[PDB]
Design a protein around this nucleic acid. Sequence first.
RNA 1: AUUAAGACAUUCGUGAGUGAUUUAUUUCCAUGAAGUGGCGU
Length: 279
Amino acid sequence: MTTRMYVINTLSNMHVGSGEVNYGVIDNLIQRDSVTNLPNINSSGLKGAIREYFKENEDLVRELFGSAPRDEKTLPGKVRFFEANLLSMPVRSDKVPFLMAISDEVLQELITKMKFFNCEEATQYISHLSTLLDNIKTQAQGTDFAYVFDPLLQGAIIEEVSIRATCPSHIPLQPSLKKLLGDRLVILSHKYFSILSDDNHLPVLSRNNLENGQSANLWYEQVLPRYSRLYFMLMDGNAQSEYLKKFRDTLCTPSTIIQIGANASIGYGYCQISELSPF
RNA sequence: AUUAAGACAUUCGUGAGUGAUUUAUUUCCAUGAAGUGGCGU
């Protein structure tokens, strides 16, 4: 059993249907965490997407994901998928087209989850992320903060929350942390991130059905913004080494794009998968 | 080997159909092409 952290990096808008009792303006909402109320993907959706991508190799699917439903013989799965949690999200700016937004609470939860799960590359990542968080907390000193690290991005204005970003020169961002969290990164207070990821500031798209030139239906759709990043955990129950290595190589190859969620025929939820690179 | 295993809230769906920046408003009112001859005592 080797627990591994995979990052998603959605290439398009992601819509994963919540299915829970919806009464508001938006007819189709996305899945949100019960505890933090941040966008997330259920491990059922992850398993379904990965099994659909790999369904053409029957033996790999049978070994790792198990037996298809309505099969006479039932075989257990060997990989355990964990829910995908939002790591960073694109927020709109004025000096640059967008900024990658992460909250200090998201960072702390990531540190706690890596410490809890014992990821393969957890040691150096935990050390560097803890140093970054301590430096950030020292710089903020209990106040609201919006920290960018490139000196050029100094003075960037996050649109929805009219916060101007500041650049503390004391805080170094390591290249691998930049790879994990994204480019053009801003680290905010969790209040700002919660405002930016709530139902009022997430992108809502209008849809209608045209019958003989007139709209029959109309509804509004919530989508996770393009270029968002989510991390999940994969646990291999000591599955066969060759199937595991083939699955990991196909998952990490640049040509492989996974569809998670709804609206597949109109290109929603198309994402890559990135393993935790050694620090 | 444990009241277990397996299962993407997913498929279909054009924010569209009808819609003159238009109705109305005087570039007008005032005014003399007119004043005056002179020497030849």
